[PDB]
């Protein structure tokens, strides 16, 4: 499997998209980015122009005006218009994100200090997922030869340290996955940037998110609500595979 959902060295953009929701986020952000870069360049060029043109050596007697109605009209309406245009594109995306469709695959995720528990209620599969290099795998949350060895054996490399876990959440490509998220002890947050999803894992609440992965590969997230000493050390690995490979994975967990 190709490692797709990961930060890349010196990156400045989003992680690659692997869901239609992530694609919508990338587009919406790209659209807002153009506007805000324009606003920022505009404001900056205005300040710099005003300082050059009206420097005390160039403009010796200051004006005294404190009003300009056309300008005050324009500079009020234009911001209002800009935000309405953004909201018009933005709300449908929000609606697409938060309206949970019918699940092909259902996973229940529980955050613990400091690891994730996964349950597939339709399959009676359950397991825990620890950072490779956490005390669970014999480490103490740092790189070491032993840790690099474990990364390699699990199908990763040194570069995936802090991202890769001992077990992955495995799902089939092009299927609707609904994830039910809760916390066991404190608040955690479950996220996969490549899917455009994030949901706090709050004790006493079960909250839902969805994604449909549009290509096979490996995708990482990291716990996104401070939850104590090993917050930095309880990541998320999702493996998106063929329908057949997913079935094979399921059968491997079936007890006869």
């Amino acid at each position: 499997l190709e490692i797709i959902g990961r930060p890349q060295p010196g990156g400045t953009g989003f992680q690659p998209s692997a869901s239609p929701v992530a694609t919508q986020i990338h587009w919406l952000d790209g659209f807002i980015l153009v506007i805000i870069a324009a606003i920022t360049i505009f404001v900056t060029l205005l300040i710099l122009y005003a300082v050059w043109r009206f420097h005390e050596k160039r403009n010796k007697v200051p004006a005294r005006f404190t009003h300009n109605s056309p300008l005050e009209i324009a500079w009020t309406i234009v911001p209002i218009v800009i935000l309405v245009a953004i909201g018009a594109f933005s709300l449908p995306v929000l609606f697409n994100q938060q309206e949970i469709p019918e699940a092909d695959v259902t996973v229940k995720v529980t955050g613990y200090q400091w690891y994730w528990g996964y349950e597939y209620p339709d399959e009676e599969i359950s397991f825990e997922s620890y950072m490779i290099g956490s005390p669970a795998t014999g480490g103490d949350n740092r790189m070491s030869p032993e840790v690099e060895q474990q990364l390699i054996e699990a199908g990763y490399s040194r570069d995936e340290f802090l991202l890769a876990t001992d077990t992955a959440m495995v799902v089939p490509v092009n299927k609707t996955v609904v994830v039910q998220v809760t916390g066991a002890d404190v608040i955690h947050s479950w996220t996969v940037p490549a899917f455009g999803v994030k949901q706090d894992a709050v004790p006493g609440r079960l909250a839902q998110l969805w994604f449909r992965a549009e290509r096979e590969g490996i995708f990482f997230g990291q716990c996104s609500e401070l939850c104590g000493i090993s917050h930095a050390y309880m990541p998320i690995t999702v493996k998106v595979v063929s329908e057949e490979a997913y079935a094979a994975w399921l059968e491997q967990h079936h007890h006869h």
Partner: protein
């Protein structure tokens, strides 16, 4: 000489707040330097569990020198303690005390022609509550805390159940520190409001009050509503921890998310409490050095009032991933976008004020112009964040960290520096050296941008907040960010040099108004420093 601390004069209390805020600021900035040392490179090199075996002093000193990864057992608890300490000091014990307690107490009575505050003994008490709060916050760092170590690793906003299950009593001390801060702020606010309403000089009508005085007045009102709400939230944490309540514990039918609603109901106003006095200072400075009256005086007042008011109905934009319904998310998104309008507008007014002026680029003016740029860069990423669908990706990442350091942290700081250079001659009788002012400005301006701009990239790449260590791929922009922080630190140490120089051997101020006629508010009609008893 320690008859400084018993004084009830608004000018003396203002100076005490400025120096104290400055000293606490130095401590909190030093925490950020250590933070950026550890974040400079992937792998943990400084915050090693091995340093705990040593003494308190010896452990401290070993922790400033990098170890090989193989000799450094990562200690995430110290990271969390430091960032919690950094945040709490800044939000409760640095910038508001400097702006509201410092410049607010010194200048608001001067600006409205009031001899002193309505209740001077209460003002003195507000200062001592600030000092007691600071003392407890700092003490908490050395008190038995989470994970059998010292200090609370819980975030400046103290989310339960983490905050309620943190061991030891470090967290209870932190909560008491915040109570004392709130009490200081509330006394200050009572004084500011009473004075502003009852003690204006004859002829000083509501429409003749300077913008800074207005900014302090609006701020004071936000404090009266926001701070008691925070007092409730944290008392509820205190009772969950010590007195058997389960407000935020599911086993007893509580809801951790309830805490968030109450905390952020204070929490949003808090950021406007921070920035409003900076808005005031920016208006005075730009009007002075553009030699031109402020563009739209009444719109400026109304915008501030409107922002202040709307700042109470947007809180849940801090909670988009916490489990809010689609309806809630949509409402808070719209409400947040609305408040963006009067806020963003004020930038146009400040530029219009410069426009057609006769501009001198002295130090205070440089800070004000820096403010306009940084506040804009920060404000526009706020616009991005308001969109809940996009916040899904950015929430609890370094993109949010970049946002609020630009808009809030640097906004307040550039406001503070603008005030200090503007007013130091007035307050002390001594003038700062102009070349050093400007050098400070440029070092800080370049440093701050190097620190925070790369953090937008870290956030886009998915780097979470509150992490001691990070995947190798985040290395480049973390390294650049850290070099920026070290340069900003150098600039701040230079600043402290500049202030020491100014106060001990700076050129004697001889004029009442050492700027120009367009600095036209009352403090510029008094001597430098003003008489003991003014008006």
């Amino acid at each position: 000489f320690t008859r400084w601390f018993m004084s009830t004069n608004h000018k003396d209390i203002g100076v005490l707040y400025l120096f104290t805020g400055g000293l606490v600021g130095l401590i909190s900035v030093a925490f950020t330097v250590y933070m950026r040392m550890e974040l400079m490179a992937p792998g943990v090199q400084f915050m090693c569990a091995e340093h705990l075996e040593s003494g308190l002093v010896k452990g401290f000193f070993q922790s400033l020198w990098p170890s090989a990864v193989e000799n450094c057992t990562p200690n995430g608890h110290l990271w969390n303690v430091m960032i919690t300490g950094h945040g709490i000091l800044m939000m409760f014990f640095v910038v508001i005390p400097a702006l509201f307690g410092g410049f607010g107490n010194y200048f608001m009575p001067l600006h409205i022609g009031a001899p002193d505050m309505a209740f001077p003994r209460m003002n003195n008490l507000s200062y001592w509550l600030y000092v007691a709060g600071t003392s407890l916050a700092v003490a908490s760092l050395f008190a038995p805390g989470g994970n059998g170590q010292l200090g609370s690793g819980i975030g400046w906003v103290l989310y339960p159940p983490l905050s309620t299950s943190e061991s030891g009593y470090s967290t209870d001390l932190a909560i008491f520190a915040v109570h004392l801060s709130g009490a200081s702020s509330i006394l200050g606010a009572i004084n500011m409001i009473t004075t502003f309403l009852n003690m204006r000089a004859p002829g000083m009508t509501m429409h003749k009050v300077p913008l800074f005085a207005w900014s302090i007045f609006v701020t004071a009102w936000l404090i009266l509503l926001a701070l008691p709400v925070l007092a409730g939230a944290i008392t509820m944490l205190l009772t969950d921890r010590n007195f058997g309540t389960t407000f935020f514990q599911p086993s007893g039918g509580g809801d951790p998310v309830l805490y968030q609603h109450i905390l952020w109901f204070f929490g949003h106003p808090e950021v406007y409490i921070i920035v409003l006095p900076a808005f005031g200072i920016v208006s005075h400075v730009i009007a002075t050095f553009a030699k031109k009256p402020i563009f739209g005086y009444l719109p400026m007042v109304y915008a501030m009032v409107a922002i202040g008011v709307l700042g109470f109905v947007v809180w849940a934009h801090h909670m988009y991933t916490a489990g809010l319904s689609l309806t809630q998310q949509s409402y808070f998104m719209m409400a947040t976008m609305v408040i963006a309008v009067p806020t963003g507008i004020k930038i146009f007014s400040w530029i219009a004020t410069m426009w057609g002026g006769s501009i001198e680029l002295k130090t205070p003016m440089l800070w004000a112009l820096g403010f306009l740029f940084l506040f804009t860069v920060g404000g526009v990423t706020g616009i991005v964040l308001s969109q809940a669908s996009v916040d899904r990706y950015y929430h609890d990442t370094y993109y949010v960290v970049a946002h609020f350091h630009y808009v809030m942290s640097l906004g307040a700081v550039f406001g503070i520096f603008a005030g200090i250079y503007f007013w130091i001659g007035k307050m002390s009788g001594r003038q700062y050296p102009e070349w050093a002012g400007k050098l400070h400005f440029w070092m800080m301006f370049v440093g701050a941008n190097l620190t925070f701009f790369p953090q937008h990239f870290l956030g886009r790449q998915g780097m979470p907040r509150r992490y001691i260590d990070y995947p190798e791929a985040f290395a480049t922009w973390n390294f650049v960010s850290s070099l920026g922080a070290f340069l900003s630190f150098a600039s701040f140490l230079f600043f402290l040099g500049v202030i020491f120089y100014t106060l001990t051997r700076g050129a004697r101020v001889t004029a009442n108004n050492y700027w120009n006629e367009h600095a036209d508010t009352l403090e510029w009609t008094l001597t430098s420093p003003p008489p003991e008893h003014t008006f």
